[PDB]
Amino acid sequence: MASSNLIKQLQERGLVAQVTDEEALAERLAQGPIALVCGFDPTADSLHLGHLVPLLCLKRFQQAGHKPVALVGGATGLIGDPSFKAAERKLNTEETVQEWVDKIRKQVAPFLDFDCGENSAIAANNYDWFGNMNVLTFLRDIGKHFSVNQMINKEAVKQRLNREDQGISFTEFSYNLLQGYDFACLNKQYGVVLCIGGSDQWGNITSGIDLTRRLHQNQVFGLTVPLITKADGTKFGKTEGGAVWLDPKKTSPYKFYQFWINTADADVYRFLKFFTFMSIEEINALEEEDKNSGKAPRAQYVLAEQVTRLVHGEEGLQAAKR
Amino acid sequence: MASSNLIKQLQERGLVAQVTDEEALAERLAQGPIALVCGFDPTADSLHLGHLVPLLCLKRFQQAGHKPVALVGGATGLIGDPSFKAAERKLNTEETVQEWVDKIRKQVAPFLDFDCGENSAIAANNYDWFGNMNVLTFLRDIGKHFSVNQMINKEAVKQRLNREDQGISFTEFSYNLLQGYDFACLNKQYGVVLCIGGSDQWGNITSGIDLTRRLHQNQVFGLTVPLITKADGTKFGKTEGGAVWLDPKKTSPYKFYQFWINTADADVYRFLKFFTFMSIEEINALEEEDKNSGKAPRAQYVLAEQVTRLVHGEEGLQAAKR
Ligand SMILES: [N-]=[N+]=Nc1cc(C[C@H](N)C(=O)O)ccc1O
Ligand SMILES: [N-]=[N+]=Nc1cc(C[C@H](N)C(=O)O)ccc1O
Numbered sequence: 001m002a003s004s005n006l007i008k009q010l011q012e013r014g015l016v017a018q019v020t021d022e023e024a025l026a027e028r029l030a031q032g033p034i035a036l037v038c039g040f041d042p043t044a045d046s047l048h049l050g051h052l053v054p055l056l057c058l059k060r061f062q063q064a065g066h067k068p069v070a071l072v073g074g075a076t077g078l079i080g081d082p083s084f085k086a087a088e089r090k091l092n093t094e095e096t097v098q099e100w101v102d103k104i105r106k107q108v109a110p111f112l113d114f115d116c117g118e119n120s121a122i123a124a125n126n127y128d129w130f131g132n133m134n135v136l137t138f139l140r141d142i143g144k145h146f147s148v149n150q151m152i153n154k155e156a157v158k159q160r161l162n163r164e165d166q167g168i169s170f171t172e173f174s175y176n177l178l179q180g181y182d183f184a185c186l187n188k189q190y191g192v193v194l195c196i197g198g199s200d201q202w203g204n205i206t207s208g209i210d211l212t213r214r215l216h217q218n219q220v221f222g223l224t225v226p227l228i229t230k231a232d233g234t235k236f237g238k239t240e241g242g243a244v245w246l247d248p249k250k251t252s253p254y255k256f257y258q259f260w261i262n263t264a265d266a267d268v269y270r271f272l273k274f275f276t277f278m279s280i281e282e283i284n285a286l287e288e289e290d291k292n293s294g295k296a297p298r299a300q301y302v303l304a305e306q307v308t309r310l311v312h313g314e315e316g317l318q319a320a321k322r
Numbered sequence: 323m324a325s326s327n328l329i330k331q332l333q334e335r336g337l338v339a340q341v342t343d344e345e346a347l348a349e350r351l352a353q354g355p356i357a358l359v360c361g362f363d364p365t366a367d368s369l370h371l372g373h374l375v376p377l378l379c380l381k382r383f384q385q386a387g388h389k390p391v392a393l394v395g396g397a398t399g400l401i402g403d404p405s406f407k408a409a410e411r412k413l414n415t416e417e418t419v420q421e422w423v424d425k426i427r428k429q430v431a432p433f434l435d436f437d438c439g440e441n442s443a444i445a446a447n448n449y450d451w452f453g454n455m456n457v458l459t460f461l462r463d464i465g466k467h468f469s470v471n472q473m474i475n476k477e478a479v480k481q482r483l484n485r486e487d488q489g490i491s492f493t494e495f496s497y498n499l500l501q502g503y504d505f506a507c508l509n510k511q512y513g514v515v516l517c518i519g520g521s522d523q524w525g526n527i528t529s530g531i532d533l534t535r536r537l538h539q540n541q542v543f544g545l546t547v548p549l550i551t552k553a554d555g556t557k558f559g560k561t562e563g564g565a566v567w568l569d570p571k572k573t574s575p576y577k578f579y580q581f582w583i584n585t586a587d588a589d590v591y592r593f594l595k596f597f598t599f600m601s602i603e604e605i606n607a608l609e610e611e612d613k614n615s616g617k618a619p620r621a622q623y624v625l626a627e628q629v630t631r632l633v634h635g636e637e638g639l640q641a642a643k644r
């Protein structure tokens with residue numbers, strides 16, 4: 001009945017929006033290292049700042065000794081996740097998505113350790129199991145476990161089905177089943193018992209938990225990180241020029257460092273908790289220090305330095321000063 | 323602008339429940355012979371009396387010079403049509419359905435002419451195009467043309483989604499898309515421009531009409547035959563022993579003839595119109611004759627003789643008397 005303090009620690013950083021059976025999860029985490037997964041869809045040839053918190057959270061779990069499975073949606077990216085989206089996602093071609101998958105897999109790799117013993121990271125691609133799956137097999141073997149009555153009640157698609165100015169394609173309506181099966185598949189092959197995801201993923205994650213129970217009779221868990229907000233109410237990671245990419249060829253390390261330096265005083269201490277590995281004690285002391293220094297706050301350049309090194313390494317940090 | 327009288331003729335037999343753009347259809351029918359389709363799902367190793375009106379209606383179209391496509395649902399029978407059904411259909415195995423498909427195809431054949439020139443019948447099986455279709459291709463290429471908002475409003479599935487004592491699987495919810503694509507596929511390969519079906523098929527047929535427009539920009543049509551009713555309110559074709567099969571090994575020709583002899587006076591003249599090729603004039607004269615004869619009505623054994631010969635031929639009619 002031992003209990004891990006990992007979920008508590010993430011909670012103090014404000015990184016847990018929702019979590020299933022927290023008490024039970026904390027006990028399972030105390031049993032020993034577990035395999036967990038976080039997934040990313042190839043919506044572009046690179047991830048951007050909107051995907052960084054979940055990615056770093058996967059790394060936070062590995063640091064605590066757990067094994068991270070970095071899933072790239074080679075199949076789901078050909079369908080489109082409608083969760084809390086106002087309109088249909090653009091449909092990209094098979095050829096282009098397969099190319100983007102490889103780019104994202106490569107971009108994700110440096111963030112995790114693939115050479116640290118049994119909790120070494122593992123890359124996954126759901127195109128492996130959906131790429132050649134026949135439609136009748138999908139509809140029968142996976143589809144019979146989903147109730148449409150329940151599906152149309154999921155909060156993630158509620159507005160699309162209720163607002164006269166919106167609608168949802170059968171294509172995107174089926175997405176929840178694909179991600180649900182992803183959890184069951186990874187549970188069966190890698191022993192994955194936890195899926196963490198973005199703030200708009202609760203329903204997709206819970207469908208995976210239920211399907212894993214229905215298919216393999218195993219209890220698994222889910223956790224979502226929060227929607228990252230800015231005090232001024234604007235969208236985090238959105239600039240006049242668009243997204244802030246993690247690919248240095250799209251958004252240079254210099255520009256990336258500039259983005260963080262510009263962080264609002266109201267957001268900077270919360271952002272240090274979400275985006276860096278500094279301890280809560282050190283961040284709290286830094287906030288107190290800035291409060292009584294009479295100098296410009298140090299928090300913005302500490303944040304810029306920390307995240308720039310995490311994303312672009314020492315080379316990018318050096319490039320940010322020339 | 324010539325107009326065919328075929329739809330009018332079927333209407334006088336009481337065989338048209340619903341029909342799309344009747345005026346336009348009648349004009350198209352006057353242009354020349356068309357290819358049309360009627361489909362049957364392998365729910366059992368034989369069809370039964372509930373499937374006979376649509377089957378004979380396909381033959382009525384061939385007699386008027388049109389070309390009948392007899393479709394057997396090798397794929398749709400692995401999914402299950404939920405239209406106006408109270409509960410999920412039983413899921414049968416791939417191996418068993420494939421066997422039943424062959425049996426039904428063989429049972430249907432004798433009802434149509436496969437050797438009468440250009441309007442010769444053609445057998446089709448939707449397993450040809452769905453059997454190996456990948457799920458992502460289905461969801462994207464067919465799925466993007468369906469609105470879930472519209473799908474949940476179809477009368478055929480309304481009760482399943484609205485009544486607390488019912489529910490529908492994603493499996494059966496997807497059926498409408500399969501049958502919809504069937505129409506588009508047959509339109510493209512065989513020039514099929516009309517689909518006729520059972521009384522519970524309006525929505526499945528209209529989805530095919532809309533998808534054929536969206537995919538191939540061709541205007542096609544649909545028609546349904548009526549739910550066959552009995553004056554006493556009980557279900558037609560239902561007996562204490564179950565269904566009345568068209569397979570003589572399941573329901574003997576003798577038993578089949580007995581079923582028709584037992585027809586209620588209130589139903590017999592309507593049944594002669596639905597189930598035989600006797601002219602309306604002859605049936606009307608027979609009703610008048612029975613009205614003023616002072617003898618037992620001749621209608622029941624005329625009906626029994628006509629339908630028994632149609633279903634089991636001269637051999638079965640002879641067997642019905644020994
Ligand atoms: N498991 N898991 N997580 C997944 C996560 C994603 C991406 C997720 N739908 C997102 O848009 O964040 C795709 C597939 C997955 O299986
Ligand atoms: N086209 N057409 N008609 C079809 C008709 C059926 C059978 C129909 N759903 C029924 O249950 O009567 C199956 C597939 C079809 O494509």
